[PDB]
Ligand binder design. Sequence first.
Ligand SMILES: Nc1nc2c(ncn2[C@@H]2O[C@H](COP(=O)(O)OP(=O)(O)OP(O)(O)=S)[C@@H](O)[C@H]2O)c(=O)[nH]1
Ligand SMILES: Nc1nc2c(ncn2[C@@H]2O[C@H](COP(=O)(O)OP(=O)(O)OP(O)(O)=S)[C@@H](O)[C@H]2O)c(=O)[nH]1
Ligand SMILES: Nc1nc2c(ncn2[C@@H]2O[C@H](COP(=O)(O)OP(=O)(O)OP(O)(O)=S)[C@@H](O)[C@H]2O)c(=O)[nH]1
Ligand SMILES: Nc1nc2c(ncn2[C@@H]2O[C@H](COP(=O)(O)OP(=O)(O)OP(O)(O)=S)[C@@H](O)[C@H]2O)c(=O)[nH]1
Ligand SMILES: Nc1nc2c(ncn2[C@@H]2O[C@H](COP(=O)(O)OP(=O)(O)OP(O)(O)=S)[C@@H](O)[C@H]2O)c(=O)[nH]1
Ligand SMILES: Nc1nc2c(ncn2[C@@H]2O[C@H](COP(=O)(O)OP(=O)(O)OP(O)(O)=S)[C@@H](O)[C@H]2O)c(=O)[nH]1
Ligand SMILES: Nc1nc2c(ncn2[C@@H]2O[C@H](COP(=O)(O)OP(=O)(O)OP(O)(O)=S)[C@@H](O)[C@H]2O)c(=O)[nH]1
Ligand SMILES: [Mg+2]
Ligand SMILES: [Mg+2]
Ligand SMILES: [Mg+2]
Ligand SMILES: [Mg+2]
Ligand SMILES: [Mg+2]
Ligand SMILES: [Mg+2]
Ligand SMILES: [Mg+2]
Lengths: 163, 163, 163, 163, 163, 163, 163
Amino acid sequence: KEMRILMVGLDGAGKTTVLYKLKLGEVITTIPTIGFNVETVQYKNISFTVWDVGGQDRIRSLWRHYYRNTEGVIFVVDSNDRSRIGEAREVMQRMLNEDELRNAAWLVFANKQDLPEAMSAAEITEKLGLHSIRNRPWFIQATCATSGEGLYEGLEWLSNSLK
Amino acid sequence: KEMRILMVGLDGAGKTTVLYKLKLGEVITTIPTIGFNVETVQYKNISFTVWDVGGQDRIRSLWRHYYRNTEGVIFVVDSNDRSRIGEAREVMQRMLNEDELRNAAWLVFANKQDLPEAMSAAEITEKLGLHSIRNRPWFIQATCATSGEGLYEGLEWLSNSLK
Amino acid sequence: KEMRILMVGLDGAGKTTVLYKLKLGEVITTIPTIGFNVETVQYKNISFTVWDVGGQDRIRSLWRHYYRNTEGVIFVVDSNDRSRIGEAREVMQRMLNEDELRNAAWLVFANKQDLPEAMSAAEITEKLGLHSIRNRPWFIQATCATSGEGLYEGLEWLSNSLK
Amino acid sequence: KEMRILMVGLDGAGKTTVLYKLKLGEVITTIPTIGFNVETVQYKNISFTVWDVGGQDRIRSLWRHYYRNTEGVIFVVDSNDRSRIGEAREVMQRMLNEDELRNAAWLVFANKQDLPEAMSAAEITEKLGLHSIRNRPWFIQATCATSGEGLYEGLEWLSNSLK
Amino acid sequence: KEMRILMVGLDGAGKTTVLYKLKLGEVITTIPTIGFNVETVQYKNISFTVWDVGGQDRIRSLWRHYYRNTEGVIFVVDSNDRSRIGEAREVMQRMLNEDELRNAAWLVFANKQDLPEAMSAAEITEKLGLHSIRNRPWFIQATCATSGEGLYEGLEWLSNSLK
Amino acid sequence: KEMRILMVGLDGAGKTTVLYKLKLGEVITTIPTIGFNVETVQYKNISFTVWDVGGQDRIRSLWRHYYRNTEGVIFVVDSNDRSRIGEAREVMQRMLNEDELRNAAWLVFANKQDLPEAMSAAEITEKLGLHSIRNRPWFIQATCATSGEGLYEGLEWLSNSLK
Amino acid sequence: KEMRILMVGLDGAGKTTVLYKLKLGEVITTIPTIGFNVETVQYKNISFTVWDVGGQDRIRSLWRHYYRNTEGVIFVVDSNDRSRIGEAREVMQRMLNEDELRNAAWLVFANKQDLPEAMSAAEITEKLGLHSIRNRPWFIQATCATSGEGLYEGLEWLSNSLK
Ligand SMILES: Nc1nc2c(ncn2[C@@H]2O[C@H](COP(=O)(O)OP(=O)(O)OP(O)(O)=S)[C@@H](O)[C@H]2O)c(=O)[nH]1
Ligand SMILES: Nc1nc2c(ncn2[C@@H]2O[C@H](COP(=O)(O)OP(=O)(O)OP(O)(O)=S)[C@@H](O)[C@H]2O)c(=O)[nH]1
Ligand SMILES: Nc1nc2c(ncn2[C@@H]2O[C@H](COP(=O)(O)OP(=O)(O)OP(O)(O)=S)[C@@H](O)[C@H]2O)c(=O)[nH]1
Ligand SMILES: Nc1nc2c(ncn2[C@@H]2O[C@H](COP(=O)(O)OP(=O)(O)OP(O)(O)=S)[C@@H](O)[C@H]2O)c(=O)[nH]1
Ligand SMILES: Nc1nc2c(ncn2[C@@H]2O[C@H](COP(=O)(O)OP(=O)(O)OP(O)(O)=S)[C@@H](O)[C@H]2O)c(=O)[nH]1
Ligand SMILES: Nc1nc2c(ncn2[C@@H]2O[C@H](COP(=O)(O)OP(=O)(O)OP(O)(O)=S)[C@@H](O)[C@H]2O)c(=O)[nH]1
Ligand SMILES: Nc1nc2c(ncn2[C@@H]2O[C@H](COP(=O)(O)OP(=O)(O)OP(O)(O)=S)[C@@H](O)[C@H]2O)c(=O)[nH]1
Ligand SMILES: [Mg+2]
Ligand SMILES: [Mg+2]
Ligand SMILES: [Mg+2]
Ligand SMILES: [Mg+2]
Ligand SMILES: [Mg+2]
Ligand SMILES: [Mg+2]
Ligand SMILES: [Mg+2]
């Protein structure tokens, strides 16, 4: 009936694009997210309330204001960006150790799969150290926010962890 | 008057196909089940509420959310897949030891009997270690969800364990 | 005015045929009874509510759900099947020791008397150890469900144990 | 109204099979009993609570945890195993000298009588030194857990020592 | 209803893997255990609270903080590691002489039996000097945490020493 | 209700084995007894508290610490060791002259009778000069601690000298 | 639930950087620590209260004000600084002899491992004389506060010495 979500990731990942592909159905032009966007999207008789936030180094320290009462998390990672996959691992291993996100479900959108140099979801699952997760449910999906592929299959998995 | 069921199994078994052969009467095209499907089907003045779930390795850890208040279980096994009959045995022996499914009735759909290389229900009864079950009623039926054979004979047995 | 009955026996005996010879008057084609059938039949201003159940080895363990509030029992035995008369004796001596059927009246339909190799009701009375019954009223009748012989003479005896 | 029982013996005897032949009525497949099984069975308006335990050399030292508040004991001995009848005698003469089982009734199931090389109950009564028992009531019955013979005649004797 | 357990052993044995094979059912990737992990697992209406600890030489001196109020111990030994079987013997003979573990039950998981060069449970029982144990119940089981074999047969034995 | 015992003898006799055959019921592996073992065993509503001590030449001089308040003594002699029967005679004639053991009952376990070259209890009674005992009750029993023979017949005799 | 920590070391080590890498997650610019910094960081349901202090020669004499009620100590040593490893040894051997830190747990962050000329944790363990520690638990971890490596593995070890 209701669910709260927090979309996060590094800069350039695709968070805003994913959100406004789910909410509107169209690919909008984007500006860097200094503040935050919040939007409700309905699916399977469930109303997800997604909070997209900034990924710039200066806003990554303000994500803590949103950890509270968060039932799911969506970590978006740019697959073409193979040089910052270590920074994302640092961020995610730091945010998995926070106690406010202790029960949160973990979903990972490996975005930008339409690009030729994109890296597979298994290569990302290995590079991010996702099998090391033990206190938490987790899942990884390959997406293309510009085409909508894999986006409605993530909200479908998040439904498993309802209530 | 009412009954709750949980259809489970490995990937590729036939759970979704069975469910929407009971509910609609037609063989639908299928996509991998990331989330869950739920459907009510009436038979013998009884309204079974079936929950079909995913079998991918990543969703097999989310089945626990559904064990509660479950009155029957339907384990679907692909008979042609003779290489994963040990993995199914592991899953079933693990899920028989859970205390939330302590009184649940056990039914086993040995599906894909229309295939030439299919294995008999007795060979499956031996490979799955079903005679070792002692705290639980159990039953095994040979099916073909594409043709509907053996599907209405399972709901008929589940009626024995009503109320 | 009312009476509850439980028809039981091994597989192949004639339970379903007896029931739908009493209820309809015609000999129906039959399928193995996986679940249960229930039918009310009126006779002598009495409405017997008969529950026919499966005899397969897998359903013989589900008969316990029906023992409660059962006022009469009808054990059907195939007379031509002279090789399974010991298994029926085991089943009946086990079900006579249950405390839910403590006051139940016992009737025995020695069916398939039309067959040449059929065994007499006295030979069955000896093989089943029926004279050993002491806590219970009992009676044995020779039948032929295909012709209706001996069927209305069993419901007539069950009337003796009304209320 | 109630009674507590402890089924014990060497490995391979038939304890689990006896228990789940009394409780279910069917012969189950078995695994070695590392821990313990406990089951209540009703008979003659009495509810026996049977505790089946392991017979492996490593578990024979954990039986002491169960001696307390035990009103009857059932020693199962394999008759075909004529080479371990001395080890069983040692175990039984040791467990007859324990003070927690000081008033316990003794019953002996000489099981596996269906086998051709089985040894008579009198030969076992002589080999086990049962007439040497003087502080205790005792009884020996010849059984066949696969067929149920002699099993309901042991619970019948245990009723003599009620309350 | 409750029970406390302490899983210990040398480094590389399989403690964390065993714990999160019992708790989750999946084989997780692992990091060296510097601190401690604690997890509750339910089985046979009993809630075992397992404490997995480090085996590095620097943490083997911090196990004493956990000896108190410990009702069972699970010593995991790598069978393929035939060069450190003496070090494990030293550790176990030292920890058997502690007075806080005076009543603790002893279980030994001889893990990594799937490897070809693995050593039998009897060879380990001889090398570890387990028959020398006299003040304590003990048991040894052959396992394969990657496949789950022998893991639910250890918790089954630990139930013998309940309360 | 209570009784104190001192088990003594030369090295290799069988003292520890006897004690932990009475206490546990199993034959344990053994190490030389440098210190002492103490164990309580119940039999015939009597709780014997047995103190097993070392027999090495260096510990035979520390037995005096235990003579006090000792109500019975159990001298174990290896029968196969026919070359040290004179040393045992010296030890026993020395320990019979001590005034702290002035009222102690004397029992002699002629152990290792299962060996072919074992010497009879009468040959030992002659070699040990047991008939020369006049200030003391005495008794000699032939044993086999590995099989338990003759062990419960010694505690039975020690009961004669209760209180 | 709570724990008090004292981070100390020589000047240039990395104490402030470590603290504000644990607390904020970012690498801050730093000024020499004339006074003291204090910060609470949560991890594993534990709230560590860390006190970072100055390392200048003039402030090393004011550390005594903080020894009291200190449950853990974190000695940070610059590995690249191979010329002051003797001064750190002096400081640490002096502060290990204080009676207010008598029960404190010892952790050693060998920081600046990202530098090419860095010295291994074993070379530091030898140069600092850490094996000479006998009245205290101790542990050494290799870190890189700029990247966060090895920092959450120290707080993990400090949890072993809780309460
Ligand atoms: N070619 C391609 N571009 C994508 C895809 N997904 C997202 N993008 C594009 O990549 C750019 C960055 O996406 P954007 O949503 O603006 O970043 P962000 O996640 O919000 O992070 P920020 O707000 O801190 S800059 C955008 O131009 C967007 O259109 C994809 O699948 N393929
Ligand atoms: N030839 C044949 N195909 C069958 C039969 N039963 C089911 N299937 C087919 O096998 C395929 C897998 O069935 P499906 O229901 O989609 O898997 P699942 O049980 O839902 O598991 P999943 O959702 O995690 S992929 C489908 O293409 C389905 O049509 C059968 O009896 N014969
Ligand atoms: N020749 C003959 N056939 C009989 C007679 N009575 C019953 N049958 C036949 O024997 C067959 C078995 O009877 P049926 O009623 O289907 O078994 P059941 O008692 O219901 O047991 P099941 O449902 O577990 S298979 C049927 O083909 C039935 O028609 C009889 O008197 N003579
Ligand atoms: N042929 C035959 N087999 C029997 C009989 N009674 C029991 N058994 C069989 O002998 C085997 C051992 O019986 P089982 O009950 O598993 O041993 P146990 O008493 O439980 O001892 P354990 O659990 O320590 S292995 C089983 O395969 C069982 O089926 C009998 O009367 N005849
Ligand atoms: N091939 C194989 N590997 C196993 C088995 N059991 C455990 N392992 C593997 O051996 C490795 C060590 O297991 P692990 O659980 O991490 O060590 P530990 O007991 O926790 O000790 P540590 O934390 O101080 S490093 C792991 O890679 C694990 O996956 C097995 O049965 N077969
Ligand atoms: N073959 C055989 N061995 C026995 C018998 N009784 C005891 N032993 C064996 O003889 C050996 C010595 O027994 P043990 O109990 O260890 O000596 P001790 O009396 O304690 O003296 P010690 O502790 O100073 S070495 C052991 O290996 C034991 O198992 C027996 O009846 N037959
Ligand atoms: N290259 C590199 N620099 C590091 C590392 N760890 C800490 N530092 C850097 O070394 C410098 C000293 O660290 P700092 O935390 O300010 O010293 P301090 O421990 O607080 O001691 P002080 O306050 O008395 S000056 C800083 O510029 C810091 O950024 C590292 O791992 N690699
Ligand atoms: Mg954005
Ligand atoms: Mg599906
Ligand atoms: Mg029928
Ligand atoms: Mg058993
Ligand atoms: Mg570990
Ligand atoms: Mg000794
Ligand atoms: Mg500083």
